[PDB]
């Protein structure tokens, strides 16, 4: 940024790193975290300082291919075929590299009839796959971790910056998922002024408890003891036709 005072050294790196891919950059898969965040920093400096990267689009279209296959990874297994930190960056690099496109691009990706419908993908495959089940009921996300859940967002936002046609779909889709239930003519409320989900997240290694009504402690403890028994748990749930 400072010592170069010229638009030359960064290009050597840009290519240098983009050169490394599902090769050694994949090999570490744990130490590549500091690799990836730098990659944003150099690309970010390119845009704001109006420094033109030569190989912009070609690299980018591979990331859609990169993200398309891993969308099928969970779709085929249920568990992502890559480590979490790689997904952190490949989404993050797509953002900065998405800046080097016009509104004719960035819409050929998102909303495009014949393009790779990437705004559709991140909405109902990466971040909100559960709500699609819920909306279909009113008729496993690729991003699991909060850092990865975030990473899907600043990619979504970058798809809308400077493109009203992409912003409309993103805003439209968010309405039918969360704010179409009531906010068609009037905007209702939760009526509780400091609200969170009262159920909790159920930590993974934790277990499901039983709520107490105030004096149901004697019956809650009994059920908890009975269920943990492997024979009672397996045998009772196998008792079919009780309905």
């Amino acid at each position: 940024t400072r010592c170069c005072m010229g638009h030359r050294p960064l290009l050597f790196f840009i290519t240098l790193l983009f050169t490394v891919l599902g090769s050694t950059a994949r090999e570490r898969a744990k130490h590549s975290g500091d690799y990836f965040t730098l990659l944003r920093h150099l690309l970010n400096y390119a845009y704001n300082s109006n420094i033109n990267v030569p190989n912009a689009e070609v690299l980018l279209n591979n990331e859609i291919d990169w993200l398309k296959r891993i969308r099928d990874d969970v779709k085929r297994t249920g568990e992502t075929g890559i480590e979490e930190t790689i997904l952190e960056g490949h989404l993050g690099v797509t953002k900065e590299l998405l800046a080097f496109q016009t509104s004719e691009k960035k819409f050929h990706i998102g909303c495009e009839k014949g393009g790779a419908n990437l705004i559709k993908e991140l909405i109902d495959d990466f971040i909100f796959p559960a709500s699609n089940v819920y909306l279909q009921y009113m008729r496993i996300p690729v991003c699991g971790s909060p850092p990865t859940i975030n990473a899907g967002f600043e990619l979504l936002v970058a798809l809308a910056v400077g493109c009203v046609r992409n912003l409309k779909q993103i805003v439209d889709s968010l309405t039918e998922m969360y704010y179409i239930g009531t906010a068609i003519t009037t905007c209702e409320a939760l009526t509780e002024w400091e609200y969170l989900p009262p159920v909790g997240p159920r930590p993974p290694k934790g277990f499901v408890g039983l709520k107490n009504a105030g004096a149901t402690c004697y019956m809650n403890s009994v059920i908890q003891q009975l269920y943990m028994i492997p024979s009672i748990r397996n045998g009772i749930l196998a008792i079919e036709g009780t309905g």
Binding site: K168, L174, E194
Partner: protein, 507 residues
């Protein structure tokens, strides 16, 4: 309970499931083995120690032992639906309130902001940024007023930031500003009530109030908005905010500072707003409130903070013309010009209007209220020094009230009153001599004077007389005209003597 794992104990209390450290045998003694133990008791703000025999009223009750999925138990001798549906809902509702979802909303709305400025040679947005604003304001309205402002501070995150995000969209465009008002404010008939008064969060009320000020301000140059039940949008917004005085303001004391900054900050804008506020009889309806004579029931909360109801009336009145209400004392002379009106303003907006004059000048309930309650503030001194200026009857009214409180009020609160008394005596107009006269002698046959309250309080409540002397010492040392009244009137001169020794002897 032990969990059957391939490679432990856990804590199972009600709906809570956590890990436990009872694998060590000492914890087994502490929780389940029970028994009596020599307890340690700390009390008396951690200064007294005593040892008490305590019974472990937590102890094991029923124990289960396991011997070291059987097909025989499934054999005869003689639904995943409810699980899915509640699991589906929790996944859906977990994301709506996830912290990184809120940081997503900020980015989605605050991005494209550099595209939202109008072209430098134009005072409106071109079609594209007009539609980007139109779409984003739809979502910002949907998100914030359904689940945005109700979420807790840890996730919602300093709702002033949401107000900043809303400012970017709402300004620079007229139809968007019209859409917002007519779709999330003038559609519910409880929007202004629930967010300005009912919301038990200072930030949200403040952010919403700052939002109404913003919309009302920048809609001044907009055309006549349709009436939501030739009136501009700011005309409607203030009318709806003023409709809360009828019932809700009375019902919802303890939440009022942020309801009056809606008017304090709407006046700190300029002259175009203060003119609007004055034409709405905002001062006239605000003096009636805090007198419980307003358009609705009295405020039901004891320690209601009306300190900003006065600062609106103070600023709004100090823009009017009291020219027709000054007397020159020295007969023949014309009334002196008012040097205590509004700075940052050339000429008075309008003559002081009737109903305001009948509450401030003709009557004296308001002057009691602000002096009694809001005396420590500095928007009251400005109102008093602006009205006491060459107004003989009013300057007596303020002295009548101030001499009452300096005498018949609680000994620990005189300093707010006495310090206010100075800037009433230190008004160098044609009536100044009288004010020092009717503060040291007292208005006869009702209110005492600074000397009289000293005599009344030398024996008991000596702190009252001491604080009165501090006022007098400060007044004489910093007012020349006061010194030529002390030096030149033997009676006041002679009484001032007895005061000084008494202070010394008590010391």
């Amino acid at each position: 309970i032990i969990q059957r794992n391939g490679g432990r104990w856990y804590k199972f209390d009600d709906g809570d499931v956590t890990e436990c450290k009872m694998d060590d045998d000492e914890e087994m003694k502490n929780q389940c083995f029970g028994g009596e133990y020599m307890g340690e008791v700390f009390d008396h703000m951690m200064k007294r120690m005593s040892y008490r025999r305590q019974k472990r009223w937590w102890n094991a009750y029923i124990l289960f032992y396991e011997r070291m999925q059987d097909d025989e138990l499934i054999r005869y001798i003689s639904i995943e639906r409810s699980v899915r549906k509640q699991n589906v809902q929790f996944m859906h509702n977990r994301m709506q309130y996830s912290m990184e979802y809120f940081q997503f909303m900020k980015k989605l709305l605050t991005c494209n902001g550099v595209y939202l400025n109008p072209p430098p040679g134009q005072d409106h947005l071109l079609p594209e940024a007009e539609e980007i604003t139109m779409i984003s304001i739809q979502l910002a309205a949907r998100f914030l007023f359904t689940t945005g402002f109700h979420t807790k501070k840890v996730v919602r995150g300093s709702a002033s930031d949401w107000y900043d995000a809303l400012c970017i969209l709402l300004r620079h465009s007229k139809n968007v500003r019209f859409w917002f008002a007519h779709n999330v404010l003038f559609n519910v008939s409880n929007r202004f009530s629930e967010y300005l008064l009912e919301c038990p969060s200072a930030e949200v009320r403040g952010a919403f109030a700052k939002l109404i000020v913003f919309i009302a301000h920048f809609s001044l140059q907009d055309g006549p908005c349709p009436s939501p039940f030739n009136l501009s949008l700011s005309d409607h917004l203030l009318r709806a905010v003023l409709n809360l005085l009828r019932r809700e303001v009375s019902e919802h004391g303890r939440h009022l500072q942020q309801y009056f900054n809606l008017f304090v900050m709407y006046a700190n804008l300029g002259v175009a707003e203060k003119t609007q506020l004055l034409k709405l009889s905002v001062p006239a309806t605000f003096m009636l409130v805090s007198l419980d004579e307003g358009p609705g029931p009295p405020i039901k909360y004891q320690y209601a903070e009306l300190g900003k109801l006065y600062s609106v009336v103070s600023q709004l009145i100090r823009c009017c013309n009291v020219s027709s209400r000054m007397q020159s004392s020295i007969n023949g002379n014309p009334p002196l010009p008012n040097p205590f009106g509004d700075p940052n303003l050339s000429q008075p907006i309008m003559p002081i209007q009737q109903n305001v004059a009948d509450i401030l000048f003709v009557r004296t309930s308001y002057v009691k209220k602000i002096i009694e309650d809001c005396s420590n503030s500095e928007e009251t001194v400005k109102l008093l020094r602006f009205c006491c200026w060459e107004n003989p009857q009013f300057s007596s009214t303020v002295l009548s009230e101030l001499l009452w409180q300096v005498a018949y009020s609680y000994t620990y609160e005189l300093r707010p009153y006495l310090d206010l008394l100075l800037q009433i005596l230190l008004i160098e107009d044609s009536w100044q001599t009288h004010r020092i006269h009717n503060a040291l002698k007292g208005i006869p046959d009702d209110r005492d004077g600074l000397f009289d309250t000293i005599q009344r309080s030398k024996n008991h409540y000596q702190k009252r007389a001491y604080q009165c002397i501090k006022c007098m010492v400060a007044l004489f040392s910093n007012c020349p005209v006061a010194y030529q009244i002390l030096q030149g009137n033997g009676d006041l001169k002679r009484k001032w003597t007895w005061a000084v020794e008494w202070l010394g002897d008590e010391l």
